[PDB]
Amino acid sequence: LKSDDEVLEAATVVLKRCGPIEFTLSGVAKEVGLSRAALIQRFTNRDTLLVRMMERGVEQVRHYLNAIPIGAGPQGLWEFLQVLVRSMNTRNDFSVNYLISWYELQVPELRTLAIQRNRAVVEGIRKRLPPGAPAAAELLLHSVIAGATMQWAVDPDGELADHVLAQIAAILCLMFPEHDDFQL
Amino acid sequence: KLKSDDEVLEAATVVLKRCGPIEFTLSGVAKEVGLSRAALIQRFTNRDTLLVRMMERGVEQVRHYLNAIPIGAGPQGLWEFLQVLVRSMNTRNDFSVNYLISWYELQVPELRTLAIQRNRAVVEGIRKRLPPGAPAAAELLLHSVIAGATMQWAVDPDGELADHVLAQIAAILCLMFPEHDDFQL
Ligand SMILES: CC[C@H]1OC(=O)[C@H](C)[C@@H](O[C@H]2C[C@@](C)(OC)[C@@H](O)[C@H](C)O2)[C@H](C)[C@@H](O[C@@H]2O[C@H](C)C[C@H](N(C)C)[C@H]2O)[C@](C)(O)C[C@@H](C)C(=O)[C@H](C)[C@@H](O)[C@]1(C)O
Ligand SMILES: CC[C@H]1OC(=O)[C@H](C)[C@@H](O[C@H]2C[C@@](C)(OC)[C@@H](O)[C@H](C)O2)[C@H](C)[C@@H](O[C@@H]2O[C@H](C)C[C@H](N(C)C)[C@H]2O)[C@](C)(O)C[C@@H](C)C(=O)[C@H](C)[C@@H](O)[C@]1(C)O
Ligand SMILES: [Cl-]
Ligand SMILES: [Cl-]
């Protein structure tokens, strides 16, 4: 496997499967089909590879959110938030995200990228707000996604998206009380 | 004389908040409470059993704390309760340890049940304080705002935790209770 991008994607697979503590160059090397020495020549060491991977994360969030088609009014916002929430993968071990997030906060380089990642998502929501959205509505919507996601991770009932989006629908009704119900 | 079980578990919880659940050891708790490692083994068997007892005490403390918050009336009484609840989270030391504690709980079924009980106690505590005319499932939305806004702050801190979270709580309460005044801290 050749490109920096192909290698960083394979390393991301490993990070999701093992978490950041058990993450190793050897495990990336075995995933991507390259020698560990090759990873070292291209990315210097474990810590530096983690940084490049998380840089690619923030890039991919921005790349992803920026091209999602924009619909009109509260209904467009609702559509966007559905796509956003459904984008989260719960198929293997969702709890690894909380270990990832914790680990990121301990390493200044990763912490800055984590901030950029959340800022990108908040700004992505902000740009989909129709006129008449309450002030700072983007912060509230991102909080509901993160908080309801946590609720479900601890105490799961049904699919993540259904738990989160029910709450999103509820807050959208409060933000746009003259709109028709938001269909989930 | 013997130190109480509550004193020992308190000391252990301080250690857990300092080192996190991966680095938590009997030796650390012993150093913290002035007791021998041997004495801790006698009373609490092992490190895993000690963590279960600490987390059982945690759920008890949550329930006791929520019961102790004065009960007001109306949307104002709910806002007052929420202010106390949010301000109850200690930010004296490294708040990010809470995310590790949460992750670890999810890995250990006995601890995960207790984390579920904790969140359920807080959700139910909010629910019992909802005035009539709060929207359906408002207690879940309010808990989500606290959790989500706290995580936003823990990743990207601007000022005090409570200030960041309560600005959003005030915002949603305005939406829930449009016929009410602005909610002031
Ligand atoms: C702690 C709990 C927090 O989770 C995380 O921070 C983990 C650690 C991220 O993965 C981190 C780390 C990592 C390696 O994925 C595990 C990386 O690939 C991503 C970009 O960021 C997640 C899952 C990201 O998902 C990514 O959302 C993109 C829009 C699409 C992408 N996917 C379709 C490709 C998906 O994975 C993303 C950006 O945070 C989702 C948005 C909705 C949020 O802001 C939500 C509210 C999160 O703050 C959160 C759930 O509260
Ligand atoms: C991950 C992020 C989550 O944090 C935790 O789960 C950590 C791990 C708990 O500590 C865990 C673990 C531990 C050891 O503390 C770190 C234990 O002592 C407490 C009870 O539970 C926190 C902090 C608890 O604080 C406690 O709130 C009580 C009302 C009063 C109590 N204390 C001041 C009287 C205070 O500690 C408590 C209950 O979760 C606060 C309520 C508001 C929540 O439900 C919020 C929304 C959380 O779910 C959260 C912030 O999203
Ligand atoms: Cl994902
Ligand atoms: Cl606390």
Q: Which string of DSSP letters, residue by residue, matches chain A? A: --SHHHHHHHHHHHHHHHHHHH--HHHHHHHHT--HHHHHHHH-SHHHHHHHHHHHHHHHHHHHHHHSPPPSHHHHHHHHHHHHHHTS--SS-TTHHHHHHHHHHHSHHHHHHHHHHHHHHHHHHHHTPPTTPPTTHHHHHHHHHHHHHHHHHHS--S-HHHHHHHHHHHHHHHH-TTSPP---
Q: Which residues surround ligand 4, an ion (CB under 5 A)?
A: B 89-90
Specify the length of chain B in residues.
185
Under 8 Å between Cβ of A106 and A114: no
Report the C-alpha gap between A126 and A119 in whole angstroms.
10
Give the three-state DSSP class for B116: helix
Best of A94, A102, A123, A125 to substitute, by most chain B Cβ atoms within 10 angstroms, is A102
DSSP string, B16-75: HHHHHHHH--HHHHHHHHT--HHHHHHHH-SHHHHHHHHHHHHHHHHHHHHHHS----HH
Q: Which domains does chain A have, with CATH numbers?
A: 1-184 (1.10.357.10)
Please tell me which of the candidates A105, A143, A153 has its beta carbon nearest to residue B152.
A143
Query: Does residue B16 have its Cβ closer than 6 Å to ligand 2?
Result: yes
- Interface contact flag, B148 A144, Cβ < 8 Å: yes
Q: Which two tokens stand for residue A49?
A: 């590879």
Ligand 2: nearest atom to the Cα of B13? 14
Report the C-alpha gap between B98 and B105 in whole angstroms.
10
Residue keyed to tokens 């759920």: B59
Q: Report the separation in Å between the CA atom of B92 and the middle of ligand 4, taken as the mean of its atom positions.
A: 9
Name the A residues in 12-51 with CB < 8 Å from any B CB: 21
CA distances from A19 to A11, A50, A57, A80, B44 (A): 11, 11, 15, 29, 31
Best of B22, B98, B155 to substitute, by most chain A Cβ atoms within 10 angstroms, is B155
Q: For residue A144, list chain B residues with Cβ-Cβ distance below 8 A.
A: 141, 144-145, 148
Measured by CA distance, the residue closest to atom 7 of ligand 1 is A97
- The identity of residue B140, as a single letter, is L
Under 8 Å between Cβ of B169 and B146: yes
End-to-end CA distance of chain B: 46
Q: For residue A150, list chain B residues with Cβ-Cβ distance below 8 A.
A: 102, 144, 147-148, 151
Report the C-alpha gap between A48 and A44 in whole angstroms.
6
- The identity of residue B185, as a single letter, is L
Give the three-state DSSP class for B3: coil
CB atoms within 10 A of CB A95: 18
Under 8 Å between Cβ of A50 and A20: yes
Q: Which two tokens stand for residue A179?
A: 């709109």
- This structure's resolution (Å) is 1.8
- In this complex, is the C-beta atom of A92 within 8 Å of any C-beta atom belonging to chain B? no
- In this complex, is the C-beta atom of B137 within 8 Å of any C-beta atom belonging to chain A? yes
The phi and psi torsions of B29 (rounded to 5 degrees) equal -60, -45
Question: What residues have CB less than 8 Å from B111, skipping those under 6 apart?
Answer: B51, B52, B55, B104, B105
Phi-psi region of A121 (alpha: psi -120 to 50; beta: other; left: phi over 0): alpha
Question: What residues have CB less than 8 Å from A7, skipping those under 6 apart?
Answer: A1, A28, A32, A34, A39, A42, A43
Q: Which of A88, A104, A110, A164 to mutate to test the pocket of ligand 1 (most atoms within 8 A of CB)?
A: A88
Under 8 Å between Cβ of B145 and B169: yes
CA distances from A54 to A25, A94, A101, A111, A142 (A): 15, 18, 11, 10, 20
Angle at alpha carbon of residue A126, lines to A122 and A128, rounded to 5°: 125
- In this complex, is the C-beta atom of A111 within 8 Å of any C-beta atom belonging to chain B? yes
Report the C-alpha gap between A97 and B97 in whole angstroms.
15
Q: For residue B148, list chain A residues with Cβ-Cβ distance below 8 A.
A: 142-150
Report the C-alpha gap between A140 and A4 in whole angstroms.
36
Measured by CA distance, the residue closest to atom 35 of ligand 2 is B89
Return the DSSP state at B185: -
Q: For residue B154, list chain A residues with Cβ-Cβ distance below 8 A.
A: 105
Q: C-alpha B126: how far from its chain's center? A: 13
Report the C-alpha gap between A98 and A85 in whole angstroms.
17
Picking from A172, A164, A78, the residue whose alpha carbon sits closest to that of residue B143 is A164
Q: Report the separation in Å between the CA atom of B4 and the middle of ligand 1, taken as the mean of its atom positions.
A: 44
Q: Which two tokens stand for residue A169?
A: 């629908």
Q: Report the separation in Å between the CA atom of A87 and the middle of ligand 3, taken as the mean of its atom positions.
A: 6
- In this complex, is the C-beta atom of A115 within 8 Å of any C-beta atom belonging to chain B? yes
Please tell me which of the candidates B103, B107, B148 has its beta carbon nearest to residue A147.
B148
Picking from B131, B168, B139, B170, the residue whose alpha carbon sits closest to that of residue B151 is B168
Helix (H) or strand (E) segment spanning residue B138: helix B138-155
- Interface contact flag, B100 A95, Cβ < 8 Å: no
Write out A139-168 in H/E/C secondary structure: HHHHHHHHHHHHHHHHCCCCCHHHHHHHHH
Angle at alpha carbon of residue B121, lines to B119 and B126, rounded to 5°: 95
Structural determination approach = X-ray
